Design a protein around this ligand. Structure first.
Ligand SMILES: CCCCCCCCCCCCCCCCCC(=O)OC[C@H](COP(=O)([O-])OCC(O)COP(=O)([O-])OC[C@@H](COC(=O)CCCCCCCCCCCCCCCCC)OC(=O)CCCCCCCCCCCCCCCCC)OC(=O)CCCCCCCCCCCCCCCCC
Ligand SMILES: CCCCCCCCCCCCCCCCCC(=O)OC[C@H](COP(=O)([O-])OCC(O)COP(=O)([O-])OC[C@@H](COC(=O)CCCCCCCCCCCCCCCCC)OC(=O)CCCCCCCCCCCCCCCCC)OC(=O)CCCCCCCCCCCCCCCCC
Ligand SMILES: CCCCCCCCCCCCCCCCCC(=O)OC[C@H](COP(=O)([O-])OCC(O)COP(=O)([O-])OC[C@@H](COC(=O)CCCCCCCCCCCCCCCCC)OC(=O)CCCCCCCCCCCCCCCCC)OC(=O)CCCCCCCCCCCCCCCCC
Ligand SMILES: CCCCCCCCCCCCCCCCCC(=O)OC[C@H](COP(=O)([O-])OCC[N+](C)(C)C)OC(=O)CCCCCCCCCCCCCCCCC
Ligand SMILES: CCCCCCCCCCCCCCCCCC(=O)OC[C@H](COP(=O)([O-])OCC[N+](C)(C)C)OC(=O)CCCCCCCCCCCCCCCCC
Ligand code: HEM
Ligand code: HEM
Ligand code: HEM
Ligand code: HEM
Ligand SMILES: CCCCCCCCCCCC(=O)OC[C@H](COP(=O)([O-])O)OC(=O)CCCCCCCCCCC
Lengths: 476, 228, 47, 51, 364, 51, 92, 91
């Protein structure tokens, strides 16, 4: 070396978190007598995103209809009574925009980014494809191969496959624990026009839909268009309200040829609209995230406890020093997946498999569970404030652009019934107490059954039983 | 000391820190065994003034000295623009901020006018006690005898060895192997090859001290109170 | 020692029976993780 | 475990025979004043004197 | 593969003849095991016919039962001599760094002290009986259980045949645990290797094959040690013993002087130099516990080198222990030696084995 | 607490114990009833009463 | 040594298969608990004999002190050595 | 590290209850060792005292010396029974 490190004796200046709160125009929301909702946030500009958000995802399948939501998404684009696929494409291309469809486990959205003068045309196209799609049977037999190829390629995304494994393991016997695209047997033969029409009739109703506008848009014009086009939507049966039970357990995929091992550990939490959502978000920010480029620079007690194990020389009185050759962790990330009535709060770790029958993953999970117990017991004010401040920043970082703002508006309108003003949110964020956060952590983490998903070399990742024995402590 | 003129201009002492060593505590805690019971308390201590005294590095005075020398180097770099050079000096260069000198490297050419009678005794003791052990007749430096152990290894020490340049590491190993071969027969090198006290350079103590500081860095800037 | 022998016999058998019942339940409980395990093999591409 | 440890330990207690010779009783109403009488107890002869 | 045998384990070239003390200790352990097994096959433990069967049946009816008994006695004495030299060497070359080897060694030392005591008890002579009595009286000072525990240990108010039978079983059992601990001792040593005259980190090109060079050196040193050992078995057969143990024990009569074996005298000194019994027991336990290296456990500690000052103080420790033993036995007739006994014990209790780097630090 | 910097500091060597998680421990007084009941329950003798 | 060798080669089970780590299970604590259960049952069976059939596995002639001048009517070893005894009676 | 304790050794799932015979034999070895050590502490080997010291000292002077002796005897018998079952299963 021969070059000193003065940082080990110098006094460093600590930046402090300062928050900037630039007020934004309020979100205006109206409802037709049918129940269709119309939400908009105007902002000075020249472009705007206009979309339709539906509250019908793949959560409402039964292993007979599995994949029908995705099939419906694909069939909506194949022509209506008035237009054809080529006519829809021609209209969109004249407008110079694209029509984006996004289907998830709970929400679907069809949105378009356009100029303020093309809003009526965009709304017309959206309404036409949503309400008046013919969905002919022959066309249904022509999209099967396309959807099969899409299933083949999404099965090649390791993160998506891991999350699908996690959801399948956590929820068995409910549509919430099913793949969005469904099994091949359903894609190739089972899904039929009857199923698609039943799904649309059941779930595409008045109170389940919102028309969202973001950017240089006019709320009055959006309301008029919604009355003109979506005023006649039926008001069918309310959204299904059953019991989705959480089955703690494990789903492990053995692929010893994979270069990295992915492990997701999650716990059961209440729903999105539960009054503990804010506390759970603060917990997610408390656990934080880590990426290999930071090295020893982990800013949470969680990551530190797991990362310094590979930098500690591990010198003992009666044993030889055993220091890791290098840091094998590729990344750590806390996550929270909420749903109308359930949730999965946990962490997602990517690291090298290591030598056969090593101890890398044993140490990683040992320290991860120890840190979860520790936060269940005691949390420090500094880390509490850090978690709240980072939650502020993260909530502000999700709103970069008209598309992102429109997606946020639509998601919150479908979930909570109305959009919570950010200021109001922050008002509730600084009212949380350290003791309340500790109680929330202890209620869901300590001595509870987790759900584990593993992809990669499983000769090193601990089995479920061992992981079930480290959610409690002997002297605690 | 070769560093003394620099220490002269920073308002510090030109005398080695080997002097000024003093006992500040009665009990030595944590109590360490296998000392005998009373000795385990540390009320009565036996020292030969050649201990490491590593834990005395955690002081504000030493940090102030190190940063004064570093500021001198940075000022010269700003004036001239040879930053690279001035940050890559060998730690045996008297201008390196972590320069360390054994008490006997200057005991023969010391001022000796400001020394207390106790400190004069300390100087004579350093020279003669070095002579007694006869590691100078083995063709060895004192820092060659700072070696890590298989169990209860001295962590800093291992790092202190890996920071050495390759050639200095190889020379250290070769000296140790020659001393091993000599010790087989309990033989010494020819009297003309005896190590002069001023040639007994402390080439590993700067690396040792740098490693100690770098290891304490994270303790004083914790991410959180309950953090690993 | 006839009577003391009989009495100790009864006590020991009763205590061991309690232990056996409890440990048998716990063994059956712990075996549940493995007795319900499920396997799936991703198929190959065959002509 | 508790009863087993106690029982194994109890195998090392004094034997009943040793607990029969430990205590003896003498009749002090038989010895007159100023007379010393010798008896046997645990092998060692014992003097009882009416001091 | 004979070559693979040669290279199975390699050590340093700086193994002076002083590094055969472990081998000699193992030799005397083997001799003790064999001679003790032969004695135990002719032994009856009971106050009625113990002293008789040692002196009248074992010694005078067998062909060389006398030689077996003398082998056993002098083997115990020489095992302790060799172990003391072994410990002194390990302190001289700063072998406390071999943490596992040192801790196993201290456990073995405690075990062997117990074995020697329980063995000496079996010869139901005057010295055996009254040494048992004194030790068990020291047991009686424990707070809130001294008499219950003493009765449990003795099986009654007095030493008897049941006590002899307990002692016989314990004496038989403990040496086998000792053999297991010797195996663990050697296992650890092979894991961390030996120190030699000086400590060096040697690559394979600087190390030598253990076999057969060091085996032949062990044979040579063991042959010389066995010559010295047999000069005592055949010509001074009761030099380490006390004649009062050739008298059948009378529980009614106390010997003029009760002195233990020469390898327990230091411990006896600790008892005599501490007027309070509970304080003496506490000091004994703390002494035995401080010989080990079990603390600190999780604090970072490492061992530096050793120097001439420490070696000189080691010589002083040896002197103080020997003088303390002699004085502890002398004080029964000469009261003025209490001063020197206490002085030697104090000097012993304040001897530094491990120089702690925690002697130097700063304050907040 | 000790008013000394007498401990060597290593890069990642802290929060080490063999009983539980540092910073997630109960108040030591919560084990008092457990220890009292255990001491009272264990420190008892048992005999078969054979004559 | 028996246990060391077994842990080196592992247990057969009901049928012999070569298993990767995903098909195996941790020994602790499931098999320790099963061992406790089976041990308690067999200890019940054992103690039934200790307290109520104490002399069923024995020959009453061993309660007669040894008489070198008299031989018993039938000399019979314990039930667990009988097969070996047979190998001696069947070979003249 | 409790996890490291769990995974230090793994076996097959086909260990039927017949595979606890080794553990039963271990239990009986422990019983024999303890009972024998207690008996030996009260035993004298000779043609004039052996038989007497078992039936007149061990079984009548202690509180449950009879129980210790019965444990030793029946533990030997059951050790042999369990070992024979162990061998038969192994075959
Ligand atoms: C025989 C002596 C028995 C008493 C004793 O411990 O003496 C040594 C103890 C300190 O010994 P030391 O070796 O200097 O220890 C320095 C340490 O940093 C410890 O220095 P310290 O002074 O901190 O240790 C005493 C400390 C209590 O210290 C502790 O609890 C831990 C350290 C105890 C000392 C080591 C073990 C002693 C056994 O006392 C307190 O904490 C009192 C309350 C202070 C609250 C904070 C300040 C106000 C706001 O006290 C004295 O020496 C004072 C009396 C001196 C008399 C002769 C002159
Ligand atoms: C006759 C006897 C027949 C057998 C009866 C025992 C039996 O069936 O045991 C199996 C049975 C299986 O355990 P389990 O029923 O699944 O769980 C019970 C506990 O939760 C198990 O809790 P644990 O495994 O956490 O053990 C509690 C505690 C060990 O216990 C204590 O530390 C308690 C004493 C604390 C103060 C003194 C130190 O553990 C530790 O001290 C080590 C934890 C930290 C490791 C380093 C990081 O119990 C054990 O194995 C007990 C633990 C044995 C030692 C290894 C741990
Ligand atoms: C109806 C519902 C019944 C209950 C449900 C049930 O069984 O659940 C299964 C459940 C457990 O089944 P698993 O999961 O397969 O595990 C059972 C075994 O681990 C594994 O069982 P395994 O299937 O592997 O078989 C055990 C195997 C492996 O060996 C062992 O497991 C060890 C025991 C082997 C047999 C005994 C050997 C003893 C050698 C030493 C003897 C020393 C004697 C000393 C006497 C001294 C006297 C002074 O040995 C044998 O299979 C050979 C024994 C065959 C016995 C039957 C022979 C019939 C023909 C007789 C011909 C005439 C003879 C002359 C008159 O419960 C039972 O098995 C309970 C016992 C049921 C037995 C009866 C079954 C129906 C018949
Ligand atoms: C006679 C003892 C002299 C002595 O200890 O001197 C060392 C002391 C300093 O040693 P110290 O401060 O390291 O320790 C004192 C000695 N013990 C450890 C036993 C408490 O020297 C002086 O006091 C110098 C006196 C002259 C100058 C003023
Ligand atoms: C003292 C501590 C003993 C061991 C503690 C332990 O393992 O507890 C968990 C186990 C139970 O583990 P468990 O698996 O049932 O549950 C642990 C997890 N919780 C607590 C969340 C359910 O407790 C016991 O085994 C209770 C009895 C322990 C032995 C007590 C002996 C006291 C003796 C005193 C006199 C000597
Ligand atoms: C299993 C091995 C051993 C057995 C079976 C055994 C057995 C015996 C027996 C029966 C006696 C009494 C006979 C006699 O006193 O001459 C005895 C005495 C003795 N044993 Fe051992 N012994 C064994 C190992 C040891 C060991 C390792 C030592 C340690 C030095 C030892 C030290 C003694 C001593 C000091 C005596 C009394 C000496 C004397 O007779 O004056 N024994 N042993
Ligand atoms: C039964 C008595 C003992 C036997 C048979 C025994 C045997 C041995 C043997 C064979 C060795 C390796 C060869 C050698 O270096 O001499 C050894 C090394 C050692 N023993 Fe022991 N030992 C005994 C008692 C002790 C005791 C009481 C200690 C004290 C802690 C001890 C400490 C050591 C140490 C430190 C070493 C390694 C020394 C070094 O290489 O630096 N031994 N012993
Ligand atoms: C003291 C008597 C014995 C004890 C305590 C003992 C103990 C054990 C234990 C604990 C196991 C592993 C657990 C199990 O699989 O049951 C085992 C396995 C085994 N033992 Fe023994 N054993 C004894 C006698 C024998 C004998 C006489 C044989 C015959 C050669 C034998 C052959 C085996 C075999 C072959 C296995 C492995 C079986 C398999 O997993 O395929 N054992 N023993
Ligand atoms: C170190 C361990 C052991 C010791 C010290 C020991 C000691 C003794 C003693 C002193 C006796 C005679 C007292 C009596 O007969 O009641 C005895 C009897 C006996 N022992 Fe052991 N023993 C041990 C282990 C074993 C083992 C492992 C077995 C085999 C299972 C065994 C089988 C027997 C048998 C069969 C008898 C005679 C049964 C009878 O009295 O009828 N012993 N043992
Ligand atoms: C290892 C754990 C599993 C073992 C479980 C079996 C436990 C033994 C059950 C019997 C315990 C018993 O009865 O003790 C009560 C008697 C009377 O005592 P007291 O309270 O009247 O003074 O106390 C006595 O009689 C004194 C001694 C009793 C003899 C106990 C024999 C132990 C047998 C162990 C079987 C494996």
């Amino acid at each position: 070396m021969t070059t000193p490190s003065l940082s080990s004796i110098l006094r460093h200046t600590r930046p402090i978190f300062k928050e900037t709160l630039r007020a934004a125009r309020p979100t205006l929301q109206n409802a037709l007598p049918n129940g269709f909702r119309i939400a908009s946030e105007s902002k000075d500009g020249d472009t705007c995103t206009v979309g339709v958000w539906i509250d019908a995802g793949s959560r409402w399948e039964t292993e007979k209809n599995n994949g029908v939501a995705h099939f419906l998404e694909h069939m909506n684009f194949k022509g209506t009574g008035k237009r054809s696929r080529q006519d829809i494409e021609f209209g969109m291309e004249k407008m110079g925009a694209h029509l984006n469809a996004y289907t998830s486990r709970e929400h679907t959205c069809y949105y378009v980014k356009c100029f303020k003068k093309d809003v009526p045309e965009a709304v017309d196209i959206l309404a036409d494809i949503l309400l008046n799609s013919k969905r002919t049977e022959q066309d249904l037999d022509a999209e099967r191969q396309t959807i099969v190829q899409e299933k083949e390629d999404v099965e090649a995304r390791i993160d998506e496959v891991l999350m699908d494994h996690l959801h399948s393991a956590a929820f068995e016997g409910s549509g919430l624990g099913l793949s969005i695209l469904g099994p091949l047997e359903n894609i190739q033969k089972s899904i039929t026009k009857g199923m698609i029409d039943d799904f649309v009739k059941t779930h595409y109703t008045g109170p389940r839909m919102a028309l969202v506008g973001s950017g240089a848009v006019d709320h009055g014009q959006l309301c008029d268009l919604a009355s003109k086009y979506f005023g006649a939507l039926p008001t069918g049966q309310p959204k299904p309200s059953g019991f989705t039970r959480f089955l703690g357990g494990d789903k492990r995929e053995t692929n010893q040829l994979n270069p990295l091992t992915h492990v997701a550990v999650a716990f059961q939490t209440p729903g999105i609209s539960h009054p503990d959502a804010i506390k759970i978000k603060v917990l997610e920010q408390l656990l934080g995230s880590y990426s290999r480029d930071k090295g020893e620079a982990a800013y949470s007690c969680f990551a530190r406890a797991i990362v310094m194990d590979f930098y500690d020389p591990k010198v003992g009185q009666f044993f030889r020093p055993n220091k890791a050759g290098h840091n094998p962790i590729h990344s750590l990330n806390a996550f929270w997946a909420p749903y109308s009535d359930v949730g999965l709060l946990g962490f997602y770790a990517i690291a090298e498999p290591g030598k056969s029958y090593g101890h890398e993953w044993e140490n990683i999970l040992h320290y991860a569970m120890r840190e979860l117990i520790r936060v269940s017991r005691n949390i420090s004010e500094e880390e509490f404030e850090r978690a709240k401040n980072q939650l502020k920043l993260q909530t502000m970082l999700q709103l970069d652009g008209t598309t992102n703002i429109a997606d946020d508006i639509g998601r919150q309108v479908l979930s909570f019934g109305a959009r919570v003003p950010l200021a109001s949110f922050f008002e509730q964020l600084d009212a949380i107490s350290r003791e309340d956060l500790i109680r929330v952590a202890h209620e869901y983490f300590y001595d509870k059954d987790p759900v584990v998903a593993v992809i990669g070399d499983t000769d090193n990742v601990p089995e479920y039983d061992a992981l079930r024995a480290v959610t409690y402590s002997v002297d605690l | 000391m070769n560093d003394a003129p620099i220490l002269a201009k920073l308002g510090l002492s030109k005398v080695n820190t080997y002097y000024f060593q003093r006992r500040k505590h009665i009990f030595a805690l944590p109590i360490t065994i296998p000392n005998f019971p009373l000795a385990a308390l540390g009320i009565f201590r036996s020292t030969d003034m050649f201990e490491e005294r590593t834990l005395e590095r955690y002081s504000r005075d030493e940090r102030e000295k190190t940063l004064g020398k570093a500021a001198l180097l940075l000022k010269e770099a700003k004036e001239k623009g040879n930053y690279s050079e001035l940050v890559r000096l060998d730690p045996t260069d008297p201008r390196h901020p972590y320069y360390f000198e054994h008490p006997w490297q200057s005991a023969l050419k010391m001022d000796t006018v400001s020394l207390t009678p106790y400190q004069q005794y300390l100087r004579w003791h350093c020279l003669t006690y070095r002579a007694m052990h006869e590691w100078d007749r083995q063709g060895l430096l004192y820092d060659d005898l700072m070696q890590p152990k298989a169990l209860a290894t001295d962590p800093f020490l291992e790092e202190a060895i890996l920071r050495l340049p390759y050639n200095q590491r190889v020379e250290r190993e070769r000296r140790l192997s020659r001393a091993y071969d000599l010790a087989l027969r309990r033989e010494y090198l020819p009297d003309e090859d005896c190590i002069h006290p001023e040639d007994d350079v402390a080439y590993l103590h700067p690396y040792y001290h740098m490693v100690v500081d770098e290891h304490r860095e994270q303790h004083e800037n914790p991410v959180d109170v309950y953090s690993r | 020692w006839w009577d003391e022998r009989k009495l100790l016999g009864y006590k020991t058998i009763a205590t061991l029976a309690v232990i056996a019942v409890s440990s048998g339940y716990y063994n059956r409980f712990l075996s549940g993780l493995w007795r319900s395990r499920r396997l799936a093999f991703r198929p190959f591409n065959y002509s | 475990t508790r009863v087993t440890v106690v029982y194994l330990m109890s195998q090392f207690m004094p034997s009943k025979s040793s607990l029969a010779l430990a205590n003896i009783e003498v009749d002090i109403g038989d010895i007159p004043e100023g007379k010393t009488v010798t008896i046997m107890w645990q092998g060692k002869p014992v003097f009882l004197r009416k001091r | 593969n004979k070559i693979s045998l040669y290279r199975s384990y390699s050590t340093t070239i700086l193994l002076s003849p002083a590094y055969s003390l472990g081998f000699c200790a193992s030799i005397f352990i083997v001799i003790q095991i064999i001679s003790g097994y032969i004695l135990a096959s002719n032994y009856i433990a009971s106050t009625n016919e113990s002293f008789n069967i040692i002196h009248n049946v074992i010694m005078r009816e067998l062909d060389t039962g006398w030689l077996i008994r003398f082998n056993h006695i002098n083997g115990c004495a020489f095992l302790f001599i060799v172990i003391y030299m072994h410990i002194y060497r390990s302190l001289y070359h700063n072998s406390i760094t071999k943490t596992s080897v040192w801790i196993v060694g201290i456990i073995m030392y405690i075990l062997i002290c117990g074995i020697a005591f329980t063995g000496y008890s079996l010869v139901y002579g005057q010295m055996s009986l009254w040494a048992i009595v004194v030790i068990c009286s020291l047991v009686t000072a424990i707070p809130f259980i001294g008499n219950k525990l003493l009765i449990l240990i003795w099986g009654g108010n007095i030493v008897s045949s049941v006590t002899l039978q307990r002692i016989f079983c314990i004496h038989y059992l403990l040496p086998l645990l000792l053999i297991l601990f010797i195996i663990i001792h050697l296992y650890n040593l092979h894991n961390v290797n030996s120190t030699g005259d000086n400590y060096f980190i040697n690559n394979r090109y600087d190390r030598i094959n253990f076999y057969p060079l060091l085996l032949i050196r062990d044979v040579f040193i063991g042959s010389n040690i066995l010559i010295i050992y047999n000069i005592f078995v055949y010509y001074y057969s009761d030099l380490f013993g006390h004649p009062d143990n050739y008298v059948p024990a009378n529980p009614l009569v106390t010997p003029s002087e009760i002195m233990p074996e020469f390898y327990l005298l230091p411990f006896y000194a600790l008892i005599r130099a501490i007027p309070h019994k509970v304080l003496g027991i506490i000091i004994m336990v703390l002494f035995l516990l401080s010989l080990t290296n079990l603390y600190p456990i999780y604090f970072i500690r490492f061992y530096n080198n050793i120097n001439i000052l420490q070696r000189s103080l080691l010589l002083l420790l040896l002197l103080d222990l020997v003088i303390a033993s002699k004085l502890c036995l002398l004080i029964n007739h000469y009261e003025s030696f209490y001063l020197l006994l206490i002085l030697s014990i104090l000097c012993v209790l304040s001897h530094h084995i491990y120089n702690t780097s925690f002697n130097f630090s700063n304050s907040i | 607490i000790v008013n000394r910097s007498t401990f060597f500091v290593v890069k990642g060597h802290k929060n080490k114990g063999l009983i539980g998680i540092a910073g997630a421990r109960h108040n030591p007084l919560v084990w008092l009833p457990t220890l009292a009941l255990g001491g009272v329950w264990a420190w008892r003798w048992a005999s078969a009463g054979t004559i």
